[PDB]
Amino acid sequence: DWNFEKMGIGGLDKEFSDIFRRAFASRVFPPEIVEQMGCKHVKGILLYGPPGCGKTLLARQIGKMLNAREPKVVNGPEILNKYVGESEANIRKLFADAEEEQRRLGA
Amino acid sequence: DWNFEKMGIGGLDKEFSDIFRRAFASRVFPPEIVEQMGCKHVKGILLYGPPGCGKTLLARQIGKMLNAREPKVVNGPEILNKYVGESEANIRKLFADAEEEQRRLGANSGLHIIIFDEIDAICKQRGSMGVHDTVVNQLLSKIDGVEQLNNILVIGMTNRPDLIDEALLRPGRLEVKMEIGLPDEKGRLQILHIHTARMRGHQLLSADVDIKELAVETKNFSGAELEGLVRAAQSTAMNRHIKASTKVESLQVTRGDFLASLENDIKPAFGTNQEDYASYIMNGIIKWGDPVTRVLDDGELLVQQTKNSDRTPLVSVLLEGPPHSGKTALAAKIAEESNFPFIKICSPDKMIGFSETAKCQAMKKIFDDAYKSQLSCVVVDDIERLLDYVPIGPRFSNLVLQALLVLLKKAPPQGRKLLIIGTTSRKDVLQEMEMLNAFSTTIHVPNIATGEQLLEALELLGNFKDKERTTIAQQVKGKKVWIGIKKLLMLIEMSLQMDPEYRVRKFLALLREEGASP
Numbered sequence: 001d002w003n004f005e006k007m008g009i010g011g012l013d014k015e016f017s018d019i020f021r022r023a024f025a026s027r028v029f030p031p032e033i034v035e036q037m038g039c040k041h042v043k044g045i046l047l048y049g050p051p052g053c054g055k056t057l058l059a060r061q062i063g064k065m066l067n068a069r070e071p072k073v074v075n076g077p078e079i080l081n082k083y084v085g086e087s088e089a090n091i092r093k094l095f096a097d098a099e100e101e102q103r104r105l106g107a
Numbered sequence: 108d109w110n111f112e113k114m115g116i117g118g119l120d121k122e123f124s125d126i127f128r129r130a131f132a133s134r135v136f137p138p139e140i141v142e143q144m145g146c147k148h149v150k151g152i153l154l155y156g157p158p159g160c161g162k163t164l165l166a167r168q169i170g171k172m173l174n175a176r177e178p179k180v181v182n183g184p185e186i187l188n189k190y191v192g193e194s195e196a197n198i199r200k201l202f203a204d205a206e207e208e209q210r211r212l213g214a215n216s217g218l219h220i221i222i223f224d225e226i227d228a229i230c231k232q233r234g235s236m237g238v239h240d241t242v243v244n245q246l247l248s249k250i251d252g253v254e255q256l257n258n259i260l261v262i263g264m265t266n267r268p269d270l271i272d273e274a275l276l277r278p279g280r281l282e283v284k285m286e287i288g289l290p291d292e293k294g295r296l297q298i299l300h301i302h303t304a305r306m307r308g309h310q311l312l313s314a315d316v317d318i319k320e321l322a323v324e325t326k327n328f329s330g331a332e333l334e335g336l337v338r339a340a341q342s343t344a345m346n347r348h349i350k351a352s353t354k355v356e357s358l359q360v361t362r363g364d365f366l367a368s369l370e371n372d373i374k375p376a377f378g379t380n381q382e383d384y385a386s387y388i389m390n391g392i393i394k395w396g397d398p399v400t401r402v403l404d405d406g407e408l409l410v411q412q413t414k415n416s417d418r419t420p421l422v423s424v425l426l427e428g429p430p431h432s433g434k435t436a437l438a439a440k441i442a443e444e445s446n447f448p449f450i451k452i453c454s455p456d457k458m459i460g461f462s463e464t465a466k467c468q469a470m471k472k473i474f475d476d477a478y479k480s481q482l483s484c485v486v487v488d489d490i491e492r493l494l495d496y497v498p499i500g501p502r503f504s505n506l507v508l509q510a511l512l513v514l515l516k517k518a519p520p521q522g523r524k525l526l527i528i529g530t531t532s533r534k535d536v537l538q539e540m541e542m543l544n545a546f547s548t549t550i551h552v553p554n555i556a557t558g559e560q561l562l563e564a565l566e567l568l569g570n571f572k573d574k575e576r577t578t579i580a581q582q583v584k585g586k587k588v589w590i591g592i593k594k595l596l597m598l599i600e601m602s603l604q605m606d607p608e609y610r611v612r613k614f615l616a617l618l619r620e621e622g623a624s625p
């Protein structure tokens with residue numbers, strides 16, 4: 001279970017459990033039963049709200065709660081460069097390392 | 108054999124058989140007899156249908172049903188990127204693996220399957236409603252040009268079959284075309300059985316989860332959303348054991364989690380969106396007279412007619428009356444009473460600030476979506492506000508009017524059914540705009556007229572006691588009133604704030620000051 005208060009966040013209490021249960025209950029639990037389950041792991045989340053409510057603060061805390069790598073960052077208005085084709089190059093480079101890790105010594 | 112159930116495919120049963128018969132048949136029987144006839148093999152297939160209905164699955168499974176090499180993949184819009192010609196040369200190299208192997212082994216080479224995604228972007232290049240002409244011409248030349256290639260195959264899939272140019276769908280090029288549609292109950296049962304198979308292989312499913320019931324519960328679903336439902340149910344059931352119960356074998360899935368996921372988690376895209384009716388029917392409906400009963404009976408008769416008719420697949424009705432009379436609260440109820448799988452509401456509230464072209468596209472998209480389901484009901488709200496009508500000059504938009512007039516008569520395709528309900532507040536203007544001769548029937552919603560009906564409505568609502576009731580009646584029964592229901596609610600709410608002694612008086616005053624009308 002999770003006690004939000006000591007992680008640096010407070011007030012976003014109810015809207016934490018829903019995401020936790022929905023998309024993070026299958027990255028925990030003994031893996032052996034999950035192998036038989038066959039369920040795949042979610043690969044997307046969307047957050048919306050007014051500015052300055054703590055949206056970024058939640059990502060850097062979810063990252064350090066699943067024992068993951070460090071968060072890569074990207075911006076929207078900058079990747080829309082004039083160079084069409086080099087934007088695709090940036091998109092490729094963004095995944096390059098994770099693609100490589102999955103390609104070798106994966107699972 | 109044609110065992111399309113052991114490979115993952117579900118509802119699709121006739122499309123597979125026909126496709127295999129017509130295309131993947133010349134390459135199955137003995138080579139000698141085929142050479143004796145010397146018949147050229149098919150070199151193209153086209154697929155269309157609603158998204159997420161099991162298209163790519165069939166494309167990838169068909170190749171493995173045959174014996175071919177790695178199936179390539181190419182994106183539609185990506186092909187029309189910043190550079191062309193170099194990307195055309197990349198297309199040439201994409202097919203060169205088969206080209207060199209072909210001339211090296213003219214009649215003893217394998218299949219080089221290439222799959223096309225969103226072929227609409229690549230081709231089409233319409234001049235109604237530049238650099239891409241080079242790509243369409245190059246693709247046409249390569250597929251079937253002076254050079255002859257036999258050991259390739261092209262499978263294209265799209266979502267808007269009409270946008271495909273007629274040049275491609277000619278003999279030699281892509282000829283066999285197929286439609287993939289939403290599954291019926293049988294398809295849903297087959298898909299649920301396929302996906303919920305491993306679960307029964309380890310006794311991890313409770314005995315109370317009846318697939319047959321779930322099949323009838325979900326209406327107008329898609330395979331992807333069925334898989335999502337199964338995933339959500341599994342997630343909830345498992346999370347039930349990562350809580351106050353045992354912490355990080357007695358694990359099973361119960362129908363309760365399935366029902367919870369159905370009602371809270373997954374929202375179908377071709378289904379009845381229940382959350383939308385909380386903002387159009389707020390205070391319910393109260394029987395203050397005969398007109399409500401008459402209107403509801405008319406609505407139910409219309410629904411019954413459209414559901415059990417074969418010579419009238421299209422029926423429309425118009426509701427009209429004075430302003431502030433509850434027109435948008437009686438139409439939604441009529442639509443909801445019927446159990447039609449597909450229901451939608453197109454209203455101006457979601458088009459604040461649009462141009463005159465976005466509205467036409469939105470309306471056409473809604474009516475296009477409504478055609479896929481086998482039973483529908485679409486509501487248009489506040490037609491005049493939709494037309495941007497102002498009585499000084501006057502002014503309005505012609506495009507929207509023409510689109511509406513054309514749409515209100517196009518019958519549903521093949522063998523389906525429809526029902527369109529409209530709402531308005533100024534019938535004479537519609538009479539002069541010729542629209543009223545496009546609708547099929549009209550219904551009139553009246554206002555409160557006599558004192559007795561006012562007394563009945565006030566009692567049924569319930570705000571005043573016996574003494575105040577008698578006091579109000581004493582004055583009210585001595586004359587006739589004219590006021591709509593919504594204004595009555597507003598006046599009651601305004602009056603109730605005053606102190607108990609003056610309430611009655613205040614209310615009376617308002618009714619006298621505003622009740623001036625015929």
Ligand SMILES: Nc1ncnc2c1ncn2[C@@H]1O[C@H](COP(=O)(O)OP(=O)(O)OP(=O)(O)O)[C@@H](O)[C@H]1O
Nearest residue numbers: 389390391392393430431432433434435436592593
């Ligand atoms: N029998 C009834 N018929 C209609 N509306 C009723 C009835 N009983 C209660 N109401 C309430 O009256 C209101 C009718 O809807 P609403 O206030 O939106 O009016 P309207 O006719 O849609 O208005 P307008 O056309 O001016 O936009 C809703 O609050 C509905 O709950």
Ligand SMILES: Nc1ncnc2c1ncn2[C@@H]1O[C@H](COP(=O)(O)OP(=O)(O)O)[C@@H](O)[C@H]1O
Nearest residue numbers: 008009010011012050051052053054055056057
């Ligand atoms: N629920 C919260 N608890 C504690 N601090 C918060 C919370 N929400 C926002 N903050 C404060 O806001 C600051 C910046 O928030 P930020 O992540 O930039 O929000 P956004 O990116 O949505 O503007 C942080 O220093 C953080 O302390």
Ligand SMILES: Nc1ncnc2c1ncn2[C@@H]1O[C@H](COP(=O)(O)OP(=O)(O)O)[C@@H](O)[C@H]1O
Nearest residue numbers: 115116117118158159160161162163164330331
């Ligand atoms: N008839 C079906 N039988 C079994 N699974 C299906 C069926 N239709 C869809 N699915 C599931 O839903 C997903 C739909 O993806 P796909 O059809 O590839 O999308 P698209 O058609 O847009 O390319 C598949 O991955 C598959 O698991």
Ligand SMILES: [Mg+2]
Nearest residue numbers: 434435489530
């Ligand atoms: Mg209205």
